[PDB]
């Protein structure tokens, strides 16, 4: 970890000098709350048929999307104070912050 430096490293490593991997790439996310899994440590809620979460059945994400999210496209309300650039900058910015790899 260099004592003096002018530029960022490509990986982000050495930005924080006391803990030099904070913000660096290919590292686990920080957690602000303990994780909640069906078995306490790995299985997601919805994994096991009939296993309730907090006394209630786990709703299917597709069912939630169908009943709450779905709406007729012809009804779309344009935002009078935001451009599509507002949407696009957010996606570009999100691609500077996080990417969660898959198998």
């Amino acid at each position: 970890c260099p004592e003096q430096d002018k530029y960022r490293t490509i990986t982000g490593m050495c930005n924080n000098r006391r803990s030099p991997t904070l913000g660096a790439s290919n590292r686990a996310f920080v957690r602000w709350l303990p994780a909640e899994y069906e078995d306490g440590f790995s299985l997601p809620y919805g994994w096991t048929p009939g296993v309730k979460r907090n006394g209630f059945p786990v709703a299917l994400a597709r069912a939630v999307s169908n009943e709450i999210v779905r709406f007729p496209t012809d009804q779309l309300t344009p935002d009078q104070e935001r451009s599509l650039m507002f949407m696009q900058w957010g996606q570009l910015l999100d691609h500077d912050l996080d990417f969660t790899p898959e198998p």
Partner: protein, 464 residues
């Protein structure tokens, strides 16, 4: 294999199909899903967590890369000019295009067989997901080459590595300025902006700059802003016919649309002069992403909002009330209580019918359901998670553009004059751009100004 099987065996976590589905009539079918890579594979001790493959810092890593071999490959190593590599087969009216990738299984080739145009190569792998994102990556690639050319004339003695590093530092500062000065105030609104992002003092090495697991899901609020079409406009901001509005299901991975259908200029015009979709409690997200996500390249069209909910469960995220508690916000226990929080009982009822308790509402779902804050596009919960995250990225960033020693007093004074419309003038054939704030301006020609009126970034303070 999660792509073709419906069996729930690791790492597959397929989304089951409910009875009376509006699209998928076969209930033995599913929406494919792979669980995110665990930080500690196969552990019986560690509570499963997921990996961030990028640098959490707002450092233009989507342009430069977050790994050294990739970062090297993205550079023009043929000379000592400190530029980034560009496409060798094609140009956009003499202007640069991103290079092509060398994927074994290329999804962009499936969008138009005839065209044979593969995916683009950028700092981040999702550069070709939608041509509007490709346009922004291409714009930032041109800005780096433009900066390194300007800096080479000012400092001829500077070598390739110095030019690359100096131009990279400026690009990253511009991403930070546009984000914290122009973007975030319009996402959070003014009261949340003052609460979670007070006036920057200086770098503090006890501020954890990592992205929180919840932020990867909470920041997906942007899915509620997505329009069902890609809008392309000609020189006079009139619809670029034929096909001035192409459905999103026909633009996913369609890199050929950038190479053969007119370049990045009509896409950027469309983004500036078209209003965003407004998130409303009864109009949350469009069916181009809810029913036909990546429809052209997959065996079945995905459901983006549902993928977000399955993703939060995969990630073991606590539900709505636990995050409302974390933020110091009241936690509703019933449909009566939740109706008050959402200022909308009909939505509270629908949510309670699915979840049973506000404790179980998936963080994206509960977050995008809350009423928007005044002059903001998120409610109190998302404003907290987003706000909290962006303060950690600013106060925990040793290379934050305002931190003493990063730039000189004069270079900061120069960087304050940048804007996204100006970056478009400098790198495209577009001569009429959005009047600042670019994120609020959306109507031609009421909210538009000439490129000559906007001032350029003065590099005078960069000379040695």
């Amino acid at each position: 294999n999660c792509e073709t099987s419906c069996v729930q065996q690791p790492p597959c976590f397929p989304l089951k199909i409910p009875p009376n589905d509006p699209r998928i009539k076969n209930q033995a079918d599913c929406i494919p899903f792979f669980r995110s890579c665990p930080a500690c594979p196969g552990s019986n001790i560690t509570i499963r967590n997921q990996i961030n493959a990028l640098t959490s810092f707002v450092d233009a890593s989507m342009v430069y890369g977050s790994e050294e071999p990739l970062a090297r490959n993205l550079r023009n190593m043929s000379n000592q000019l400190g530029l980034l590599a560009v496409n060798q087969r094609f140009q956009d009216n003499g202007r640069a295009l991103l290079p092509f990738d060398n994927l074994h299984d290329d999804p962009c080739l499936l969008t138009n067989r005839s065209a044979r145009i593969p995916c683009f190569l950028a700092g981040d792998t999702r550069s070709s997901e939608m041509p509007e994102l490709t346009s922004m990556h291409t714009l930032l690639l041109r800005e780096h080459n433009r900066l390194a050319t300007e800096l080479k004339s000012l400092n001829p003695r500077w070598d390739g590595e110095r030019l690359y590093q100096e131009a990279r530092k400026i690009v990253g500062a511009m991403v930070q300025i546009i984000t914290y000065r122009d973007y975030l105030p319009l996402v959070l609104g003014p009261t949340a902006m003052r609460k979670y992002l007070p006036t920057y003092r200086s770098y503090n090495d006890s501020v954890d700059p990592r992205i929180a697991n919840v932020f990867t899901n909470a920041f997906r609020y942007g899915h509620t802003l997505i329009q069902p079409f890609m809008f392309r406009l000609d020189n006079r901001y009139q619809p670029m016919e034929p096909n001035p509005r192409v459905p999103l299901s026909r633009v996913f991975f369609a890199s050929w649309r950038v190479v053969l259908e007119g370049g990045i200029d009509p896409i950027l015009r469309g983004l500036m002069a078209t209003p965003a979709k407004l998130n409303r409690q009864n109009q949350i997200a469009v069916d181009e992403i809810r029913e036909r996500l990546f429809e052209q390249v997959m065996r079945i069209g995905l459901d983006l909002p549902a993928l977000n909910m399955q993703r939060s469960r995969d990630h073991g995220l606590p539900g709505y009330n636990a995050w409302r508690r974390f933020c110091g916000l009241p936690q509703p226990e019933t449909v009566g209580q939740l109706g008050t929080v959402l200022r909308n009982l009909k939505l509270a009822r629908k949510l309670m019918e699915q979840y049973g308790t506000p404790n179980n509402i998936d963080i994206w779902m509960g977050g995008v359901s809350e009423p928007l804050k005044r002059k903001g596009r998120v409610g109190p919960l998302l404003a907290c998670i987003i706000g909290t995250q962006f303060r950690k990225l600013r106060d925990g960033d040793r290379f934050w553009w305002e931190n003493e020693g990063v730039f000189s007093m004069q270079q900061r004074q120069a960087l304050a004059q940048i804007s996204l419309p100006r970056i478009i003038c400098d790198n495209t054939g577009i001569t009429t751009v959005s009047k600042n704030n670019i994120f609020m301006s959306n109507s031609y020609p009421r909210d538009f100004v000439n490129c000559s009126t906007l001032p350029a970034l003065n590099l005078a303070s960069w000379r040695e």
